[PDB]
Amino acid sequence: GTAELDALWNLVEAQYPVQTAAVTTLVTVPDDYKFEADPPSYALAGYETSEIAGLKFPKGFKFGVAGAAIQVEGAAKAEGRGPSTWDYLCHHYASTQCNNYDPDITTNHYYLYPLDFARLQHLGINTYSFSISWTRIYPLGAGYVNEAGLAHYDAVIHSAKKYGLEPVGTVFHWDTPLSLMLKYGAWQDTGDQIVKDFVTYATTVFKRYGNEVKTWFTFNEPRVFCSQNSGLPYNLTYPEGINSTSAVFRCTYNVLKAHGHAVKVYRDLVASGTIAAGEIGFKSDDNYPIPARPGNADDEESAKRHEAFRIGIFAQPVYGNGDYPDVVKETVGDMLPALTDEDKGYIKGSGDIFAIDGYRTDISHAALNGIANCIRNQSDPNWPVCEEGSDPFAHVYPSGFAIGQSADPLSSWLVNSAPFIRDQLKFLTQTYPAKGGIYFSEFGWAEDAEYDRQLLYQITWDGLRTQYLTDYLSQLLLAVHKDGINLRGALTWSFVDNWEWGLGMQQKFGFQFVNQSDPDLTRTFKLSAHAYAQFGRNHLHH
Ligand SMILES: *[C@@H]1O[C@H](CO)[C@@H](O[C@@H]2O[C@H](CO)[C@@H](O)[C@H](O)[C@H]2NC(C)=O)[C@H](O)[C@H]1NC(C)=O
Ligand SMILES: *[C@@H]1O[C@H](CO)[C@@H](O[C@@H]2O[C@H](CO)[C@@H](O)[C@H](O)[C@H]2NC(C)=O)[C@H](O)[C@H]1NC(C)=O
Ligand SMILES: *[C@@H]1O[C@H](CO)[C@@H](O[C@@H]2O[C@H](CO)[C@@H](O)[C@H](O)[C@H]2NC(C)=O)[C@H](O)[C@H]1NC(C)=O
Ligand SMILES: *[C@@H]1O[C@H](CO)[C@@H](O)[C@H](O)[C@H]1NC(C)=O
Ligand SMILES: *[C@H]1O[C@H](CO)[C@@H](O)[C@H](O)[C@@H]1O
Ligand SMILES: *[C@H]1O[C@H](CO)[C@@H](O)[C@H](O)[C@@H]1O
């Protein structure tokens, strides 16, 4: 075995070791598997608006679910895997950064996936979005490849297709290799080793899986990911010249570069016949907020600044003019490395598809102390967007009423803003056009205080999640037929209650309940799973 790997896990486990699940064997699905009974017929009867009666998504529409490796897999040390920055974080600062959880086991999907896939087939799901753990493939981020890790996802993809699930792959979903962070600061790299290391990793998984995975995302929510680089454990290892503010924009640049170069490799692999042709982009998130006071020039300005910093900083280089938005360049200056002409040749046009994690739409109130004042004060709490960023503004009209229903208060960024979906899709497809169209690549609900229920029947009738998914799907269906949006699919986050980063298993996003007090981590369908299934039955082509 490799010695540097052992040293890294010794480091990670210095205060407490990785916990091992009760099941560490690939489960097999018996042909006599009995699914729990359906909910009462009145639970969803006549539940959809009449406005969508008889409307169908286009043929081939990806009607599916989304997960991510470190959030659902567990098996943190199984079969050669090296540690990620989150393994380190939670094993060292669990009580302050991870809500006293860690991703050691989560839902144990690493071993339970055939059972998960059989349950998804029962619901008529036709698409399975997953991410690949970089450190299962290159346990040190770079150097030797872990064949056991490559073979694992071979079996996952094969099992998915056997159960009717088209696999959609994300190369990087926030699980930075700890080794690369320690060696040179990972995404804060002031050189370009992080790009070389990411591209080598991406090349390996494209070669191994590109004949069976034909829809790829390089990065999941790169704007959200790079803002995490301002905290632990990344700010233990900043290179000289980097602080927690400039770390975010050095990360932005390195990710844009890594994305462009990986897309270049992917296209080379397709053009050489090495792998089947597919489509590649990255997953955007956030939104173009509505101004708090329509027609007010300040709210309108802060709304666009929000869009520029939360979407445009990655989407304009890839799908637009090939450079950062001007309002970004003017505010952050030289903390953001400039895109050279050579850089732009890789990045511009490197997205066949757009994908939006369209959870919600916000409201933009211009900074009460003036946008012009805010912009110039890097220490202003609303810098650099210079809208009022706190919850009592971001979700609230001047009237004092919210834009919509709030979800669990620990995920206060999340609200049901279904009436605004069609406007977001129109803005995104006109501003960041992609030949392959647009995916609604994540959307989901954290039902308020669902973690405090003690009785299963109280959990499984999850009315506000059911409403949210049905509302959103209905608006997506209307975006296709009324607005002509080239919508390629809808993927809900998520199919199981899983490990939600710093909140751990407390926050429940699944349309299935995962019983974390049971050695088998038994899954149970919630009502929302059946609402999702029924919407697929009523509105997909068969
Ligand atoms: C590094 O990141 C951590 C977050 O993981 C930052 O923690 C903040 O620390 C300040 C100082 O005590 C507290 O006011 C904040 O509440 C902390 N935030 C969190 C989320 O714990 C830390 O500031 C960063 N260190 C820097 C910038 O040097
Ligand atoms: C982190 O680094 C940035 C620069 O990389 C610092 O911003 C500089 O701040 C000085 C002092 O006002 C200015 O002269 C420069 O104009 C700033 N650079 C910019 C904004 O482009 C930033 O202050 C550092 N942050 C902290 C808190 O250490
Ligand atoms: C830049 O923003 C910082 C943070 O808001 C401002 O610092 C505050 O100054 C106000 C003045 O009344 C005090 O009430 C706060 O105690 C200060 N807080 C901190 C953390 O410094 C600073 O005034 C702003 N500078 C400007 C407007 O140029
Ligand atoms: C979860 O499973 C445990 C152990 O079997 C059982 O104690 C508990 O009732 C279950 N909780 C549910 C279904 O909410
Ligand atoms: C859980 O426990 C096993 C021992 O059975 C270890 O191999 C693993 O690393 C984890 O500590
Ligand atoms: C999964 O791995 C664990 C590690 O301790 C074993 O105990 C178990 O028998 C299975 O092989």
XYZ file of C-alpha atoms and ligand atoms in Angstrom:
662
model
C 0.000 0.000 0.000
C 0.917 3.663 -0.420
C 2.548 5.294 2.592
C 1.552 8.898 1.860
C -2.092 7.793 1.799
C -1.760 6.175 5.240
C -0.121 9.350 6.562
C -3.023 11.435 5.241
C -5.657 9.238 6.896
C -3.634 9.171 10.137
C -3.760 12.964 9.981
C -7.528 12.974 9.331
C -8.178 10.434 12.083
C -5.829 12.050 14.652
C -8.699 12.907 17.021
C -11.196 10.202 16.088
C -11.251 7.408 13.515
C -13.529 6.885 10.545
C -16.655 5.006 11.559
C -17.476 1.905 9.581
C -21.041 1.093 8.515
C -22.861 -2.019 9.660
C -23.109 -3.087 5.987
C -19.883 -3.092 3.986
C -20.955 -5.514 1.289
C -22.605 -4.707 -2.021
C -26.242 -5.423 -1.370
C -28.207 -7.539 -3.849
C -31.875 -6.825 -4.620
C -34.101 -9.923 -4.259
C -36.544 -10.330 -7.101
C -39.332 -10.594 -4.463
C -38.534 -7.173 -2.950
C -41.684 -5.730 -1.561
C -42.227 -2.028 -1.813
C -44.220 -0.264 0.875
C -47.840 0.383 -0.051
C -49.049 3.436 -2.005
C -50.530 6.451 -0.179
C -54.317 6.969 -0.163
C -55.672 7.796 -3.596
C -57.083 11.106 -2.348
C -53.612 12.265 -1.224
C -52.656 13.405 -4.739
C -56.035 13.165 -6.514
C -56.823 16.333 -8.422
C -53.692 17.857 -6.998
C -52.149 19.415 -10.113
C -53.415 22.661 -11.588
C -55.812 22.261 -14.504
C -53.576 24.402 -16.626
C -51.242 21.470 -17.382
C -53.863 18.812 -18.112
C -52.582 16.617 -20.927
C -49.283 18.470 -21.422
C -46.174 16.320 -21.851
C -42.458 16.970 -21.541
C -40.504 16.401 -24.785
C -39.457 12.879 -25.722
C -36.289 11.882 -23.920
C -36.822 14.397 -21.101
C -34.567 13.451 -18.202
C -36.936 12.973 -15.286
C -34.685 12.183 -12.424
C -32.929 12.620 -9.106
C -29.585 14.014 -7.980
C -27.044 13.045 -5.344
C -23.362 13.705 -4.756
C -20.625 11.293 -3.765
C -19.633 12.638 -0.367
C -23.246 13.397 0.604
C -24.669 9.890 -0.030
C -21.861 7.353 -0.436
C -20.200 6.855 2.917
C -17.447 4.236 2.667
C -15.054 7.110 3.303
C -12.001 4.801 3.514
C -13.286 1.847 1.495
C -11.385 0.347 -1.426
C -8.466 2.756 -1.518
C -10.226 6.121 -1.199
C -8.133 9.046 0.010
C -9.480 11.847 2.196
C -11.127 15.030 1.001
C -11.041 18.397 2.737
C -14.458 17.556 4.241
C -13.177 14.317 5.782
C -10.497 16.445 7.455
C -12.883 19.238 8.459
C -15.443 17.039 10.125
C -12.980 14.881 11.913
C -11.309 17.890 13.402
C -13.956 20.519 13.809
C -17.140 18.508 13.943
C -18.697 20.423 16.752
C -18.175 23.832 15.225
C -18.232 23.267 11.527
C -20.179 20.119 11.002
C -23.070 20.149 13.429
C -21.485 17.098 15.121
C -21.763 14.908 11.998
C -19.218 13.615 9.525
C -19.516 12.061 6.056
C -18.051 8.692 7.164
C -21.230 6.707 6.395
C -24.074 9.121 5.411
C -26.684 6.991 3.520
C -24.223 4.154 2.687
C -25.209 4.439 -1.009
C -21.709 3.128 -1.848
C -23.019 -0.322 -0.907
C -26.782 0.149 -1.160
C -27.002 1.661 -4.653
C -28.565 -1.427 -6.350
C -31.355 -1.273 -3.767
C -31.661 2.498 -4.193
C -31.897 2.032 -7.980
C -34.614 -0.615 -7.681
C -36.628 1.795 -5.536
C -36.123 4.619 -8.055
C -37.308 2.323 -10.877
C -40.459 1.666 -8.842
C -41.130 5.430 -9.148
C -40.509 5.645 -12.902
C -37.420 7.765 -12.506
C -35.472 7.599 -15.762
C -32.331 9.593 -14.859
C -29.754 9.337 -12.070
C -27.413 12.272 -11.465
C -24.301 11.444 -9.405
C -20.832 12.784 -8.804
C -17.513 10.960 -8.825
C -15.287 11.184 -5.756
C -11.949 12.455 -7.082
C -10.141 10.787 -4.168
C -11.592 7.393 -5.029
C -9.840 7.749 -8.411
C -6.639 9.604 -7.441
C -6.446 9.125 -3.658
C -3.752 11.820 -3.467
C -5.417 14.033 -6.084
C -2.557 13.368 -8.497
C -0.131 10.530 -9.114
C -1.269 6.924 -8.837
C -4.713 5.839 -9.907
C -6.912 3.673 -7.718
C -8.319 0.947 -9.977
C -10.792 -0.163 -7.297
C -12.356 3.292 -7.426
C -12.649 3.252 -11.207
C -14.247 -0.194 -11.035
C -16.767 0.936 -8.410
C -18.331 3.537 -10.691
C -18.233 1.008 -13.560
C -20.571 -1.104 -11.461
C -22.712 1.881 -10.381
C -23.282 2.978 -13.987
C -24.054 -0.569 -15.094
C -26.522 -1.064 -12.242
C -28.181 2.287 -13.015
C -28.750 1.372 -16.677
C -30.042 -2.063 -15.670
C -32.725 -0.311 -13.570
C -33.687 2.061 -16.397
C -31.700 5.077 -15.149
C -29.709 7.168 -17.632
C -26.509 8.180 -15.782
C -25.532 11.860 -15.596
C -22.068 12.464 -14.189
C -20.516 15.336 -12.252
C -16.727 15.302 -12.168
C -16.300 17.563 -9.125
C -18.855 18.154 -6.366
C -16.800 20.032 -3.704
C -14.719 17.064 -2.384
C -11.275 18.606 -2.855
C -8.426 16.109 -2.294
C -6.817 16.885 1.058
C -3.392 16.015 -0.378
C -3.595 18.797 -2.965
C -4.745 21.339 -0.379
C -1.776 20.544 1.865
C 0.738 20.391 -0.980
C -0.003 23.742 -2.619
C -3.362 25.201 -1.493
C -5.512 23.316 -4.072
C -7.862 25.834 -5.736
C -5.911 28.733 -4.207
C -2.902 27.589 -6.264
C -1.089 30.693 -7.493
C 0.508 28.494 -10.138
C -1.398 26.069 -12.372
C -0.757 22.656 -10.804
C -4.392 22.447 -9.674
C -5.483 22.774 -13.325
C -3.082 20.056 -14.470
C -4.189 17.777 -11.635
C -7.895 18.350 -12.279
C -7.484 17.820 -16.024
C -5.601 14.549 -15.524
C -8.375 13.367 -13.198
C -11.125 14.472 -15.611
C -9.345 12.787 -18.546
C -9.276 9.493 -16.624
C -12.989 9.476 -15.809
C -13.981 10.653 -19.331
C -11.971 7.768 -20.814
C -13.368 5.218 -18.386
C -17.067 6.173 -18.515
C -17.650 8.306 -21.617
C -19.088 5.402 -23.599
C -21.925 5.055 -21.059
C -22.244 8.557 -19.531
C -23.213 11.021 -22.237
C -24.138 14.035 -20.101
C -21.340 15.520 -17.997
C -20.902 18.433 -15.603
C -17.391 19.527 -14.720
C -18.193 21.498 -11.536
C -21.221 21.567 -9.295
C -22.148 25.137 -8.316
C -18.623 26.579 -8.670
C -19.661 29.945 -7.197
C -20.934 28.302 -4.006
C -17.849 26.059 -3.887
C -15.374 28.923 -4.230
C -17.040 30.898 -1.442
C -16.361 27.933 0.868
C -12.626 28.391 0.112
C -12.743 31.348 2.485
C -13.183 29.040 5.463
C -11.775 25.951 7.034
C -9.944 23.916 6.167
C -8.871 25.894 3.106
C -7.752 28.878 5.129
C -5.271 26.672 7.000
C -3.180 26.403 3.807
C -3.440 29.625 1.784
C -0.387 30.283 -0.420
C 1.610 33.438 0.098
C -0.373 36.347 -1.344
C -3.807 34.829 -0.621
C -6.290 35.756 2.093
C -9.831 34.561 2.735
C -11.266 37.212 0.398
C -8.865 36.828 -2.530
C -9.011 33.024 -2.044
C -12.547 33.121 -3.445
C -11.542 34.787 -6.696
C -8.301 32.849 -7.151
C -10.525 29.765 -6.831
C -12.926 31.240 -9.418
C -10.146 31.632 -11.923
C -8.585 28.231 -11.325
C -11.993 26.535 -11.679
C -12.804 28.371 -14.937
C -9.411 27.283 -16.269
C -9.836 23.695 -15.072
C -13.291 23.626 -16.644
C -12.130 24.956 -20.017
C -9.173 22.567 -20.243
C -11.243 19.548 -19.175
C -13.912 20.387 -21.788
C -11.123 20.636 -24.364
C -9.927 17.161 -23.377
C -13.481 15.812 -23.483
C -13.960 17.134 -27.029
C -10.608 15.633 -28.095
C -11.728 12.262 -26.713
C -14.979 12.490 -28.677
C -13.290 13.738 -31.864
C -10.732 10.940 -31.766
C -13.395 8.254 -31.387
C -12.057 7.258 -27.971
C -15.492 7.769 -26.363
C -19.056 8.197 -27.552
C -20.152 11.759 -28.204
C -21.990 13.393 -25.331
C -22.627 16.852 -23.899
C -20.759 18.739 -21.194
C -21.246 21.893 -19.136
C -21.248 22.812 -15.448
C -24.030 23.343 -12.907
C -24.915 26.969 -12.219
C -26.988 28.030 -9.241
C -28.660 31.044 -7.612
C -30.788 33.475 -9.604
C -31.490 36.908 -11.073
C -33.436 38.511 -8.213
C -36.487 40.686 -8.642
C -35.978 44.308 -7.521
C -37.704 45.061 -4.236
C -39.256 48.203 -5.759
C -39.895 47.734 -9.487
C -38.632 50.637 -11.545
C -36.318 51.763 -8.737
C -32.903 52.240 -10.345
C -31.038 51.182 -7.187
C -32.895 47.877 -6.670
C -32.541 47.163 -10.328
C -28.816 47.803 -10.160
C -28.295 45.617 -7.100
C -30.351 42.853 -8.739
C -27.993 42.817 -11.712
C -24.927 42.948 -9.444
C -26.333 39.881 -7.707
C -26.763 38.069 -11.036
C -23.256 39.079 -12.098
C -21.532 37.832 -8.931
C -23.670 34.691 -8.452
C -24.107 33.484 -12.071
C -22.332 35.721 -14.582
C -18.857 35.435 -13.109
C -18.777 31.816 -14.371
C -21.481 31.819 -17.048
C -20.332 34.885 -18.998
C -16.812 33.473 -19.616
C -18.304 30.129 -20.745
C -21.576 30.960 -22.558
C -21.294 34.712 -23.127
C -18.648 37.125 -24.363
C -15.758 35.138 -22.864
C -14.876 37.522 -20.030
C -16.049 38.278 -16.518
C -18.983 40.699 -16.213
C -17.864 44.319 -16.142
C -19.439 45.073 -12.750
C -17.364 42.220 -11.304
C -14.093 43.414 -12.838
C -14.692 46.916 -11.599
C -15.347 45.909 -8.019
C -12.910 43.084 -7.284
C -10.023 44.336 -9.426
C -6.826 42.330 -9.228
C -7.998 39.851 -6.613
C -9.558 38.212 -9.677
C -6.845 37.023 -12.097
C -7.438 38.333 -15.611
C -8.480 35.903 -18.335
C -5.711 35.850 -20.935
C -6.435 35.388 -24.631
C -5.142 31.838 -24.363
C -7.413 31.235 -21.334
C -10.432 32.539 -23.251
C -9.713 30.166 -26.138
C -10.346 27.233 -23.796
C -13.176 28.736 -21.719
C -15.376 30.551 -24.246
C -17.816 28.079 -25.798
C -16.942 25.285 -23.311
C -20.585 24.594 -22.397
C -22.845 22.470 -24.653
C -25.586 22.663 -22.045
C -26.665 25.098 -19.381
C -27.742 23.721 -16.020
C -29.373 25.686 -13.216
C -29.887 24.491 -9.655
C -33.023 26.577 -9.664
C -34.051 26.282 -6.015
C -35.445 29.804 -5.610
C -35.636 33.443 -6.672
C -34.637 36.248 -4.297
C -35.569 39.906 -3.901
C -32.847 42.560 -4.225
C -32.974 45.622 -1.955
C -30.170 48.070 -2.704
C -27.815 48.587 0.234
C -29.464 50.987 2.673
C -26.201 52.940 2.994
C -25.998 53.378 -0.799
C -24.584 51.069 -3.482
C -21.851 53.561 -4.350
C -20.818 53.636 -0.691
C -20.889 49.854 -0.372
C -18.947 49.080 -3.535
C -15.894 51.019 -2.262
C -15.804 49.425 1.205
C -14.451 45.917 1.065
C -15.271 45.724 4.740
C -18.970 46.498 4.161
C -20.974 43.393 5.186
C -22.852 43.564 1.856
C -19.685 43.808 -0.258
C -19.360 43.059 -3.184
C -22.965 42.635 -4.327
C -24.120 45.656 -2.293
C -27.708 44.548 -1.921
C -29.033 43.887 1.578
C -28.006 40.239 1.869
C -29.713 39.249 5.114
C -32.899 37.141 5.216
C -35.343 39.949 6.262
C -34.549 41.586 2.890
C -33.484 38.853 0.454
C -36.848 37.067 0.780
C -39.187 39.973 1.580
C -41.149 42.581 -0.374
C -41.339 46.183 0.877
C -44.849 45.179 2.060
C -43.208 42.923 4.662
C -44.623 39.729 3.141
C -42.281 37.060 1.816
C -41.839 36.164 -1.837
C -43.160 32.735 -0.856
C -43.214 29.870 1.610
C -40.029 29.458 3.646
C -38.516 26.044 4.245
C -36.602 24.953 7.343
C -34.996 27.966 9.097
C -31.538 26.336 9.063
C -31.771 26.487 5.240
C -33.323 29.966 5.151
C -31.922 30.683 1.682
C -34.624 28.265 0.419
C -38.156 29.444 -0.406
C -40.884 28.233 -2.778
C -40.756 30.848 -5.528
C -42.469 28.781 -8.229
C -44.260 31.737 -9.934
C -40.830 33.077 -10.989
C -39.356 29.947 -12.600
C -40.437 30.849 -16.138
C -38.829 34.285 -15.927
C -35.542 32.796 -14.669
C -35.461 30.263 -17.520
C -36.213 32.992 -20.083
C -33.418 35.160 -18.694
C -30.932 32.280 -18.583
C -31.609 30.930 -22.070
C -31.471 34.391 -23.671
C -28.352 35.476 -21.735
C -26.319 32.232 -21.649
C -27.521 30.293 -24.699
C -26.302 26.723 -25.091
C -26.904 24.598 -28.141
C -28.016 21.667 -26.034
C -30.585 23.617 -24.008
C -30.981 23.878 -20.256
C -31.348 21.414 -17.385
C -33.144 22.140 -14.119
C -30.343 20.187 -12.505
C -31.323 20.534 -8.809
C -34.467 21.609 -6.985
C -35.790 20.404 -3.688
C -37.131 21.051 -0.244
C -35.985 20.921 3.364
C -39.246 20.279 5.232
C -39.283 22.408 8.401
C -38.197 20.485 11.534
C -38.687 17.135 9.793
C -35.634 15.996 11.802
C -37.636 16.321 15.054
C -40.460 13.957 14.108
C -40.415 10.729 16.089
C -43.136 8.811 14.231
C -42.734 7.653 10.640
C -46.285 8.525 9.525
C -45.673 12.155 10.500
C -42.542 12.269 8.309
C -43.935 10.595 5.208
C -46.900 12.924 4.639
C -44.565 15.783 3.671
C -47.012 18.352 2.368
C -44.741 21.330 1.738
C -42.104 19.287 -0.129
C -44.897 17.635 -2.160
C -46.298 21.088 -2.962
C -42.842 22.432 -3.846
C -41.942 19.632 -6.268
C -45.379 19.685 -7.907
C -45.394 23.511 -8.175
C -41.906 23.502 -9.700
C -42.540 20.629 -12.121
C -45.773 22.331 -13.226
C -43.928 25.586 -13.963
C -41.202 23.698 -15.834
C -43.859 21.999 -17.983
C -45.429 25.395 -18.738
C -41.993 26.849 -19.588
C -41.685 24.203 -22.316
C -45.154 24.675 -23.814
C -45.833 28.358 -23.176
C -42.357 29.864 -23.457
C -40.624 27.432 -25.810
C -37.769 26.779 -23.368
C -35.453 24.018 -24.603
C -35.640 22.220 -21.246
C -33.721 18.927 -21.218
C -34.685 17.616 -17.815
C -35.605 18.046 -14.188
C -33.514 16.506 -11.418
C -34.670 16.795 -7.866
C -32.330 17.039 -4.924
C -32.580 14.516 -3.555
C -33.734 10.916 -3.616
C -32.679 10.286 -0.019
C -32.211 12.291 3.130
C -28.433 12.663 3.083
C -25.453 14.520 4.568
C -25.977 18.259 4.007
C -22.443 19.643 4.450
C -22.077 21.670 7.695
C -25.602 20.705 8.813
C -24.891 16.984 8.464
C -27.820 14.604 8.539
C -30.020 17.101 10.396
C -31.322 18.763 7.216
C -33.721 16.532 5.247
C -33.870 17.040 1.473
C -34.996 13.530 0.442
C -38.249 12.429 -1.077
C -37.356 9.230 0.785
C -36.710 9.046 4.528
C -33.429 7.390 5.561
C -33.671 5.950 9.063
C -30.380 7.013 10.639
C -31.145 5.066 13.833
C -31.327 1.780 11.935
C -28.235 -0.317 11.023
C -29.724 -0.962 7.584
C -30.434 2.770 7.001
C -33.845 1.714 5.733
C -35.366 3.944 3.045
C -39.084 4.800 3.164
C -40.984 6.636 0.423
C -42.443 9.966 1.448
C -45.593 11.334 -0.186
C -43.393 13.599 -2.285
C -41.783 10.555 -3.924
C -45.243 9.412 -5.076
C -46.142 12.930 -6.206
C -42.942 12.920 -8.255
C -43.798 9.460 -9.612
C -47.361 10.466 -10.472
C -46.229 13.660 -12.227
C -43.907 11.509 -14.333
C -46.786 9.168 -15.175
C -49.080 12.053 -16.192
C -46.587 14.216 -18.056
C -43.847 12.097 -19.630
C -44.018 10.453 -23.036
C -44.178 6.667 -22.865
C -11.497 30.709 8.193
O -12.751 30.099 8.079
C -13.575 30.037 9.206
C -14.872 29.383 8.787
O -14.759 27.993 8.576
C -13.875 31.442 9.672
O -14.567 31.365 10.903
C -15.091 32.598 11.384
O -14.315 33.093 12.454
C -14.688 34.344 12.988
C -13.650 34.698 14.019
O -13.884 33.931 15.174
C -16.059 34.219 13.597
O -16.577 35.517 13.797
C -16.974 33.574 12.580
O -18.223 33.326 13.182
C -16.402 32.283 12.030
N -17.273 31.683 11.074
C -17.591 30.415 11.164
C -18.440 29.888 10.061
O -17.221 29.708 12.066
C -12.589 32.178 9.861
O -12.929 33.517 10.050
C -11.701 32.114 8.654
N -10.422 32.617 9.025
C -9.806 33.627 8.474
C -10.563 34.465 7.537
O -8.666 33.876 8.719
C -6.715 40.436 1.000
O -6.026 40.824 -0.174
C -6.543 41.891 -0.941
C -5.617 42.145 -2.076
O -5.315 40.874 -2.608
C -6.579 43.104 -0.071
O -7.204 44.163 -0.748
C -6.309 45.250 -0.905
O -6.440 46.132 0.180
C -5.527 47.221 0.179
C -5.782 48.067 1.411
O -6.975 48.837 1.228
C -5.787 48.048 -1.058
O -4.760 49.008 -1.235
C -5.875 47.222 -2.310
O -6.457 48.110 -3.249
C -6.785 46.042 -2.080
N -6.839 45.194 -3.221
C -7.928 45.111 -3.935
C -9.247 45.277 -3.266
O -7.873 44.902 -5.110
C -7.497 42.749 1.033
O -7.592 43.868 1.863
C -6.942 41.641 1.856
N -7.973 41.388 2.779
C -7.690 41.206 4.035
C -8.779 41.512 5.000
O -6.620 40.807 4.400
C -16.735 50.045 5.875
O -17.561 49.126 6.541
C -17.170 48.855 7.857
C -18.021 47.726 8.348
O -19.342 48.188 8.332
C -17.457 50.101 8.643
O -16.996 49.932 9.971
C -18.016 50.292 10.881
O -18.072 51.682 11.077
C -19.281 52.054 11.729
C -19.368 53.557 11.811
O -20.439 53.885 12.687
C -19.286 51.484 13.136
O -20.580 51.668 13.718
C -18.909 50.011 13.148
O -18.547 49.651 14.475
C -17.736 49.722 12.245
N -17.590 48.306 12.169
C -16.454 47.764 11.806
C -16.422 46.275 11.774
O -15.488 48.428 11.510
C -16.718 51.263 8.048
O -17.255 52.422 8.648
C -16.959 51.371 6.562
N -16.099 52.365 6.007
C -16.518 53.292 5.178
C -17.982 53.551 5.056
O -15.733 53.926 4.535
C -35.874 3.723 12.534
O -35.393 2.437 12.833
C -35.221 2.146 14.205
C -34.501 0.835 14.475
O -35.107 -0.219 13.765
C -36.560 2.100 14.868
O -36.158 2.202 16.206
C -37.314 3.370 14.583
O -38.652 3.191 14.973
C -37.264 3.801 13.133
N -37.740 5.140 13.089
C -38.604 5.585 12.222
C -39.129 4.679 11.179
O -38.959 6.713 12.283
C -14.283 1.326 10.352
O -13.839 0.135 10.942
C -12.995 -0.718 10.125
C -12.533 -1.849 11.017
O -13.468 -2.909 10.874
C -11.810 0.059 9.549
O -11.184 -0.752 8.566
C -12.259 1.349 8.875
O -11.115 2.071 8.444
C -13.115 2.177 9.794
O -12.225 2.616 10.825
C -17.255 -5.103 5.244
O -16.040 -4.611 5.807
C -16.020 -4.752 7.226
C -14.780 -4.068 7.788
O -14.604 -4.446 9.157
C -16.040 -6.232 7.590
O -16.092 -6.372 9.014
C -17.240 -6.933 6.965
O -17.107 -8.348 7.132
C -17.353 -6.605 5.481
O -16.307 -7.271 4.764
